[PDB]
Design a protein around this ligand. Sequence first.
Ligand SMILES: Nc1ncnc2c1ncn2[C@@H]1O[C@H](COP(=O)(O)OP(=O)(O)O)[C@@H](O)[C@H]1O
Lengths: 82, 418, 418
Amino acid sequence: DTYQPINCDDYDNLELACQHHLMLTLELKDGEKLQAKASDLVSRKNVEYLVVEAAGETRELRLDKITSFSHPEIGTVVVSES
Amino acid sequence: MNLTELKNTPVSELITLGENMGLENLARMRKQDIIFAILKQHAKSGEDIFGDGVLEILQDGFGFLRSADSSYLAGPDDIYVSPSQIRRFNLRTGDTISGKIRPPKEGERYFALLKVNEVNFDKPENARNKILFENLTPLHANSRLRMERGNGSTEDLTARVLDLASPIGRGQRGLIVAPPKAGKTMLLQNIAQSIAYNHPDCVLMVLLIDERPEEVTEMQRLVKGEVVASTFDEPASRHVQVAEMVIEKAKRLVEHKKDVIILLDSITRLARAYNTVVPASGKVLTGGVDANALHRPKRFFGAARNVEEGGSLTIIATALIDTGSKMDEVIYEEFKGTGNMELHLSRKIAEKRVFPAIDYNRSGTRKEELLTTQEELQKMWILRKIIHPMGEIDAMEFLINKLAMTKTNDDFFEMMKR
Amino acid sequence: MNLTELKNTPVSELITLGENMGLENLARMRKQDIIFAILKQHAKSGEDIFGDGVLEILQDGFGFLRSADSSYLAGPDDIYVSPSQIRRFNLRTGDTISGKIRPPKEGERYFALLKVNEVNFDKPENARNKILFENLTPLHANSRLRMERGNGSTEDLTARVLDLASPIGRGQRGLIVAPPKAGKTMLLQNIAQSIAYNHPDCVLMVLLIDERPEEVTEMQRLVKGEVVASTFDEPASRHVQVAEMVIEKAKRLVEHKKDVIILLDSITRLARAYNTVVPASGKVLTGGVDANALHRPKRFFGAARNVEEGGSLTIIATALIDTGSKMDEVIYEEFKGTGNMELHLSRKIAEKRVFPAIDYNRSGTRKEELLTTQEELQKMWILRKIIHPMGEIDAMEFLINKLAMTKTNDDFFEMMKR
Ligand SMILES: Nc1ncnc2c1ncn2[C@@H]1O[C@H](COP(=O)(O)OP(=O)(O)O)[C@@H](O)[C@H]1O
């Protein structure tokens, strides 16, 4: 329900990925993957959102829901809720 | 462990703590180096390490979390904040950030911020919606800061004379004009004690600029608040940096509807520091003072105001006169009409070893009707009529004896009235 | 929306408007930035945007419409005017322009004026052919400014005393000589409210140079009209910039057959500002002043005149004496009698907490017969004779008590005879 901001180190990597406009391998705890490109990081009603598109979908999802992200360039960093 | 608790422990205890953790050769290095070494050793265990400080955004866009214990001095133990973090929460210089930190990665130098917990002693969500300081409407001071403790001690005489001479209110822009060897340092200590005792809610910050090293330690022991100083050993750029950090930190607290009091010593040394730092514009006034060098100190001194929305900023600076330097004289000439409160110390009274050395006739306040009540104002008017003809030396001797016989000012008034 | 209506909105309300428009992070930024962000968001819809301001001509032919709300401070909200627009009309500095504006395009940072609707509160073509201010034929003062309200309150007598001491009309220079702590600010406020009440038709402009921030807000909320001020935080170049904008705007209104009044406080600080900013030509005079630098303040003061064609320009400057400085006297010595009307205030009379502190003996206006009817001249002449023997201190006590039970000046003159 209530949103919890992610750690600062995780946010910097995501912004680095968005700035370079590189491919992002979004992962969740369920086990689903979305190899898509993230455009930019935005905030809405004190909750930041990440807009990531694969073929023009440009879906917007919460940052705290994202569990893991990997790429050959940046390290395979998992997020921590605590 | 907590980073701020490490900076408060004495160096001898830090070494014993470091040595039993496996560290060696910690005795011969600086305290900031010891703290940085200890933090890295504790980071091996993977435990959470907390920290806090005041943000200072550099030109390149990244900032550091300096600590008030080191007087905002750059050191190895400063916490690095990425420019994205300043973007994520809109942070300005002077924000007090507290939260978890992480050890440096490969290729890094400083500890980095990991998770912001509080900003300006408040949640990050609320701290981002505070209106900027420049958008607040200044007002005249109307809530009075009473210096009189009322315990009847001899140290309370200086505070009581201060109320009679020049009342101080929240949001005042004070100026204490003092020659050398006039007891200026002991005057500020009485004010700091009176503020910390009568008004515990107000945030008290003491700023010493170009001060002797032994005077800094004495002030820190006495003053019950935050004391930040820059000794004369440090370069002129250091003096500017401390002043910038203090005024920006004060502004952020005022935006949260808090009363902030700044005791500055001295505005003359601060103005001289800016004169060295700023590039020469080609227009130099008498005494070697650059024309636009005084723009920066007046920004510092002009920030004192009573905010209509809530909170206030009180600045009580001291100006140096009769120092034998023409640079001091011209600097003082540019601050004469700036302040709304004026207190004059005289060397002649100090030469007779009668304290405080306040020149009662030349000291006063503007719009004092707002600070004092109707009956209180009339009594001060009656008293000022008596003190007006007599000379300055006799004015204090007459006033000290009358105040000594009583305990409070109202008792002094009724005794004087009869 | 209308820019001028948007600019007068409180900052707290402006943030709420931006939130409803989808903007974020509008807090913790200056009011000008908030206005600029909101306008761009609204212009994204495509609706028409109305804006107005006072034209300022740069050295490169650039035109900007500054705002009186921000005291003509350069900012993002300023409207850019192309040189082609200036060439189309008879546009110079100080020409008020109202019209529709457009959002900036690529390579542009300021909104651009698109369709100018009103210039100087009249048709744009009419203002394209007008007689320049210098070409207007000067003439002495014929009309008189009535500074009487008739309410008989405790504040009305101050207007009467200055009216009796020296009458003031329209189109002649005026000077007020005031020492520190002499009720100078209260005198200006009393004059300013009297002028607005008695003469709603005339345009009242109050100019404050190097003033404390708390005094500006008090003046704005009290004076009904236009109040433009620059605090001591701003650099010297800002002080002269404000002065130039006010006088040029005053001239244009005069050209359109309007009688404008400028209240200056103070010419000494304005003159000091010019000395700092004007480059040195190698000529150094006593007191650290330059003769060529002093040529500009006197031009500002010397522009006051009564136009035979119509309207007038009235300037009532203020001069500071015995402030303890050195160049202050030199500034005063350059304006000993350059003004048609002169009024003096004394520290001694103000010391006894009795106001006003007007010195009747020192005050005096030249060619006073052109202002009031001949029958009243004898009434003032006999008043001077009955007040000349006693001292200036006792003169004020005599005036106040005798006028305490008197309603207007006419009753006082009749009661004086009997
Ligand atoms: N309020 C006071 N009561 C008693 N003595 C005082 C007081 N203020 C100053 N003095 C005396 O004045 C001397 C020098 O004052 P100091 O604090 O050095 O002034 P400054 O810092 O301006 O040089 C001290 O030795 C102290 O004994």
